[PDB]
Amino acid sequence: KEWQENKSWNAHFTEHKSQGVVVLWNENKQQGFTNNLKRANQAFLPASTFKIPNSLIALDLGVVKDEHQVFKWDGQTRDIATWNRDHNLITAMKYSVVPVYQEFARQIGEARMSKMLHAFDYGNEDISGNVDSFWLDGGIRISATEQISFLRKLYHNKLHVSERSQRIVKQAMLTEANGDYIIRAKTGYSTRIEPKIGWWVGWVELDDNVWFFAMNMDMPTSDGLGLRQAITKEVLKQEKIIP
Amino acid sequence: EWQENKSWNAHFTEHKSQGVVVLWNENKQQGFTNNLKRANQAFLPASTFKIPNSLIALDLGVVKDEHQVFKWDGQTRDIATWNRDHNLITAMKYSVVPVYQEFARQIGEARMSKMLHAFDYGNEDISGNVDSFWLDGGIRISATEQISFLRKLYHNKLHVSERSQRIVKQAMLTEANGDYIIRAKTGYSTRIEPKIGWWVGWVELDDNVWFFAMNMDMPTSDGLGLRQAITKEVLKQEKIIP
Numbered sequence: 275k276e277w278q279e280n281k282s283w284n285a286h287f288t289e290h291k292s293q294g295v296v297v298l299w300n301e302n303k304q305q306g307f308t309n310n311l312k313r314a315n316q317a318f319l320p321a322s323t324f325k326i327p328n329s330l331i332a333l334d335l336g337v338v339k340d341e342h343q344v345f346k347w348d349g350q351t352r353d354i355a356t357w358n359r360d361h362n363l364i365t366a367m368k369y370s371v372v373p374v375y376q377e378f379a380r381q382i383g384e385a386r387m388s389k390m391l392h393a394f395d396y397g398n399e400d401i402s403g404n405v406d407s408f409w410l411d412g413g414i415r416i417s418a419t420e421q422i423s424f425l426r427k428l429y430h431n432k433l434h435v436s437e438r439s440q441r442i443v444k445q446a447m448l449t450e451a452n453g454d455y456i457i458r459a460k461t462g463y464s465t466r467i468e469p470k471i472g473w474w475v476g477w478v479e480l481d482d483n484v485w486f487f488a489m490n491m492d493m494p495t496s497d498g499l500g501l502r503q504a505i506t507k508e509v510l511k512q513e514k515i516i517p
Numbered sequence: 518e519w520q521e522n523k524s525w526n527a528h529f530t531e532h533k534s535q536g537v538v539v540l541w542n543e544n545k546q547q548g549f550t551n552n553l554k555r556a557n558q559a560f561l562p563a564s565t566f567k568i569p570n571s572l573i574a575l576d577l578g579v580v581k582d583e584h585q586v587f588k589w590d591g592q593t594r595d596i597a598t599w600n601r602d603h604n605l606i607t608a609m610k611y612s613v614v615p616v617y618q619e620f621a622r623q624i625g626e627a628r629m630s631k632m633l634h635a636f637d638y639g640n641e642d643i644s645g646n647v648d649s650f651w652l653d654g655g656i657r658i659s660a661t662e663q664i665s666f667l668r669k670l671y672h673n674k675l676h677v678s679e680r681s682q683r684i685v686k687q688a689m690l691t692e693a694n695g696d697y698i699i700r701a702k703t704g705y706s707t708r709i710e711p712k713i714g715w716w717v718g719w720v721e722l723d724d725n726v727w728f729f730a731m732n733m734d735m736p737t738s739d740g741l742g743l744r745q746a747i748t749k750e751v752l753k754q755e756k757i758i759p
């Protein structure tokens with residue numbers, strides 16, 4: 275009853291002819307739920323979900339002064355139009371602006387990046403590859419359950435970076451809020467290395483509880499990117515976490 | 518700097534209401550209102566006072582953080598959401614007066630008076646004890662003075678810790694999606710005429726911030742939804758939100 279398998283959630287994947295895992299962690303009850311215990315512990319490239327620890331490290335080291343500091347567009351036109359403009363940390367997270375985060379990684383450098391991921395206990399802690407692309411096509415690997423462990427430390431300000439760094443990244447993770455819930459989260463789509471997968475990791479703040487979540491799914495084409503959030507919400511709805 | 522647009526009066530008249538909306542375009546440093554006179558008239562702050570109260574409680578360590586639980590005193594009050602344990606996030610969301618009265622008592626009148634003066638928040642001539650003055654009319658503030666105060670909080674320029682300001686801005690979170698974030702606080706004042714509703718806060722866009730402060734006559738609790746509805750009709754008219 276610590277970690278419970280609910281195979282009924284597979285219907286939310288099979289409805290879309292898809293396969294994946296959703297992991298939930300009920301913070302008040304200290305109980306975890308997943309449709310697939312094995313896939314819940316399978317490690318993948320973090321892709322854009324790495325923007326969480328990258329943001330934290332950049333802030334703690336003063337590579338990023340605050341969430342208002344402007345990162346000037348380098349004038350190279352890329353396939354994603356929202357990237358071809360100046361950004362701050364809020365918009366860089368919202369639009370997953372890779373080039374901004376690659377520049378952070380170069381200024382952090384390999385020695386500080388490696389040490390800080392070890393201090394974070396982050397996935398396999400392995401930065402092997404390019405200092406500015408290892409989370410896209412390098413050695414780093416993290417499971418859904420390891421995303422939850424990391425996110426629980428961030429939520430509680432327990433990572434070995436400044437409280438201020440943690441509050442700024444949690445602000446930048448803000449995705450959705452209304453009168454029922456707040457979602458702080460980060461999407462990712464890993465396409466450089468097989469298998470192509472989509473992530474959504476974060477948490478749902480309720481009045482008197484927090485539900486952490488980490489989901490990934492097979493994403494052979496960009497068609498189904500909306501399924502990351504739609505399937506997670508169908509699970510949260512089934513479990514009565516959100517109306 | 519401050520422009521009167523009487524066309525926004527229609528957003529009030531359509532609902533047989535009277536009030537003021539003030540907008541502040543942060544990038545352009547320009548303000549807009551339907552009524553310059555009312556924009557500068559001071560009203561009881563009611564629950565909008567929970568912003569400075571929260572800041573002072575955090576800065577002094579009366580509130581440790583936004584997770585600290587304030588236990589229900591077991592007395593049933595007529596707002597059901599009050600009758601339960603709260604933290605700073607839910608105390609703000611549900612405007613839990615008794616929690617804020619206890620903060621005020623621990624802050625004490627000397628520290629409360631000094632901190633409100635440093636904030637430039639409301640009239641300097643405050644009558645009433647520390648747990649009642651903001652409820653009973655010892656303090657008043659205008660829509661334009663709400664904007665000035667909110668702009669200082671947004672920029673972490675108030676004379677409290679940066680941390681205190683970030684925690685209150687987190688607690689002000691009201692609505693967010695892919696188009697905008699609203700950080701704001703509702704108020705409803707019924708102790709002294711005119712009974713009024715407030716909504717003060719801001720709209721964070723990708724590339725700008727629009728500060729807002731609205732109050733309106735609220736003769737019954739039936740109209741409380743109009744505080745947000747009228748503000749959003751104005752934000753929609755000005756193309757600030759879709």
Ligand SMILES: *C(=O)[C@H]([C@@H](C)O)[C@H]1C[C@@H](SCC/N=C/N)C(C(=O)O)=N1
Pocket residue numbers: 320321322323354370372410461462463464496499
């Ligand atoms: C992060 O995981 C991604 C980065 C590494 O490219 C971004 C890219 C988008 S998918 C939209 C790209 N269009 C494809 N045709 C993304 C996401 O939606 O999660 N994260």
Ligand SMILES: *C(=O)[C@H]([C@@H](C)O)[C@H]1C[C@@H](SCC/N=C\N)C(C(=O)O)=N1
Pocket residue numbers: 562563564565595596611612614651652703704705706707708
């Ligand atoms: C803030 O403006 C408060 C919320 C609930 O609207 C409001 C509560 C009252 S005291 C309790 C009144 N009793 C029944 N509702 C209050 C005030 O007096 O300033 N503000």
